[PDB]
Structure 1
Amino acid sequence: VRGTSFDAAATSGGSASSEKASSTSPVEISEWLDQKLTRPELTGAKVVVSGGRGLKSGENFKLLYDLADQLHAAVGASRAAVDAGFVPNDMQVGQTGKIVAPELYIAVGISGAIQHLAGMKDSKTIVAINKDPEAPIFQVADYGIVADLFKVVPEMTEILKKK
C-alpha cells in the first residue's frame, strides 16, 4: 500500500487485544549483519527545496536549510537567487543550471519563468509558496499557497519537528 495514498489512522483511539502469535522454526539461510543511515547532493536526491529572489538575501536561506534537514533534503535555487549574490552556481536549478526531477521539489519565492520550469517540470511532486497569485509557477505546481514565505516556511519546519 502506497503510504501517501492513505491517511494515518489515529495513533490513539481504539484499544486492541494482543495475543501471542504462532511459532516458526529458525531457517538460517540468511543473517543480518550491519547498518548505515545517512543534506544530499542536489541532482541525485529525491527531495529538493529551492528559493527564488523572494528570500532577499543569502543569510535568509537559513530558513530553507532549516527545512531541508527536516526533509533530509537538497537545497537549490533559481538563477535570480544566484545572480543577486545569495548562493553559488552549482545549485541553480533550471535551463543554464542542474536539470533535476526528484520526488519532491519546493519552489520558494520563485515566479516560475519558462527557463526555470525547464530545469524541473519533471519533478514528480512540486510545491509553490509565492505571495503574488498570478505567478507563472502555480500552473506546474501540484500544490501551493498565495502567501508570505517568512511566515509559511518557518511554520512548516515546526509541523515536522513532530508529525
Structure 2
Amino acid sequence: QSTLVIAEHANDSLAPITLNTITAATRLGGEVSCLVAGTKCDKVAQDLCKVAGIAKVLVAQHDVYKGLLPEELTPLILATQKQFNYTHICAGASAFGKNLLPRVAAKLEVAPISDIIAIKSPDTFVRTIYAGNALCTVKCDEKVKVFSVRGTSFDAAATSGGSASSEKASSTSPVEISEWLDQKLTKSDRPELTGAKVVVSGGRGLKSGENFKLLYDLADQLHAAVGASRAAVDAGFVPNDMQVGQTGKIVAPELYIAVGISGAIQHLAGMKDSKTIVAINKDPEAPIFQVADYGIVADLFKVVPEMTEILK
C-alpha cells in the first residue's frame, strides 16, 4: 500500500489544499510519496520535504509543464506508476485536481472517486451526492484507487517534522496537443475563500456591485473572505471565482455570514458545514433561515453598516 499525492502549487508556493490531502493520504496507513511537477519546483520540493508524513518527494521540473496541462502531466504520472506501483493516487478536489485525476484514471482504466469527505478503510470512502444532500459510502475494488479529497474535510498536515528524500522523476517526451496561452487572475488582498476562518457572502439582495463595498468593509473588521451566489456573479457584481456552492467553491469556515442570499439548494451545498451560520435577510420565509444558527429579518443596508460600526 503506497500513496502518491499530486502536489498543487504555483509561484514557488504550495497550494494549501495539498496539505489537507496529505492528511487524508496518511489515513490510508501506507507510505506516502509526493510528486511535484512544473517549470520551477526547487523551492516547493524543499518545503514538502519538511511536511510531516511524507516519505518521498519526486521532482519533475521542465518547461513542458507550463500551465500544468493534463495531457503533459498524465504521461509523467503513468511513468511514475509503472516504476513505483502505487495503490492509491490522490490530489485535492480543486480545479486542478478535478481536471487532472479523471484523465489519469482513464489511462489506468479504473473508476475514480470524486471529492471524498471521509476514509473508512483503504478501499471504502464517503462522498456527497445531490448537492450535498445525501452521503454515499462507496467500496472501491479497483487495482489502483484514484480519488480527489475535499480540503475542508481533513486538517492540514504540519509543515514541519517531516523528513523526505527528494528524487528526480521519470520524465517523458512532450505530447503537445494543447497549449497554455494566458490567464487572468482576480487580484485581491482578502484571504482565500477556501481557507478563511470567516466568510461574508452576498447575493442578489445587494442590488449592485458598488453596494458590495459594504461587505468588504464588514469583511475587514472580521479579516474575512468575501464570497457570493450565482445571482451576484451573473449580475456582474463580482467575478465567478467568488461563487460559493455546488458549481463553485466549498467552504466550511468557523463563521459564515450570508447577506441578501435566499439560501437555495445549490448555494447551501458549498457552506452548510460551516460551524456557525448567520443570515441577514428581510424575508422571514427565506430558506437560509432553516440552516442559520443566528438570523435577523431585516434590511442588510441597515444591519450591515451597523455591524461594521459595532465592530469598530
Q: Higher helix fraction: Structure 1 or Structure 2?
A: 2
TM-score of the pair, normalised by structure 1: 0.74
Q: 2:175 aligns with which of 15, 27, 31?
A: 27
What's the secondary structure of 1:32's corresponding residue?
strand
Kindly provide the CA deviation profile for residues 98-145 of structure 1, in whole angstroms up to 9, marking residues without a partner as x: 011010100000000011001110011101000011000001010011
Q: In structure 2, what is the Cα distance between the partners aligned to 1:85 and 1:37?
A: 16
Q: Number of matched residues?
A: 161
| Percent identity between the two aligned chains | 100
More divergent stretch after superposition (85-94 vs 9-18)? 9-18
TM-score of the pair, normalised by structure 2: 0.39
Q: In structure 2, what is the Cα distance between the partners aligned to 1:36 and 1:48?
A: 23
Q: 1:91 to 1:28 in 2, by over 3 A?
A: closer
Instruction: Return the offset for 1:29.
Output: 59
Q: In structure 2, what is the Cα distance between the partners aligned to 1:158 and 1:62?
A: 15
Larger relative CO (CA 8 A, sep 6+): 1 or 2?
1
Q: In structure 1, what is the Cα distance between the partners aligned to 2:234 and 2:177?
A: 58
Instruction: Return the offset for 1:65.
Output: 0.4
Kindly provide the CA deviation profile for residues 49-102 of structure 1, in whole angstroms up to 9, marking residues without a partner as x: 000100011111000001000001100000111111100011100010001101
Q: In structure 1, what is the Cα distance between the partners aligned to 2:168 and 2:249?
A: 54
Q: CA RMSD in A?
A: 10.9
Q: In structure 2, what is the Cα distance between the partners aligned to 1:94 and 1:80?
A: 12
Q: 1:126 to 1:20 in 2, by over 3 A?
A: same
Structure 1 unaligned regions, length at least 5: none
Ranges of 4+ aligned residues in structure 1 off by more than 2 Å: 1-39
More divergent stretch after superposition (101-110 vs 9-18)? 9-18
Structure 2 unaligned regions, length at least 5: 1-148
Q: Higher strand fraction: Structure 1 or Structure 2?
A: 2
CA contact (8 A) 2:194 2:251 kept: yes
Q: In structure 2, what is the Cα distance between the partners aligned to 1:111 and 1:147?
A: 13
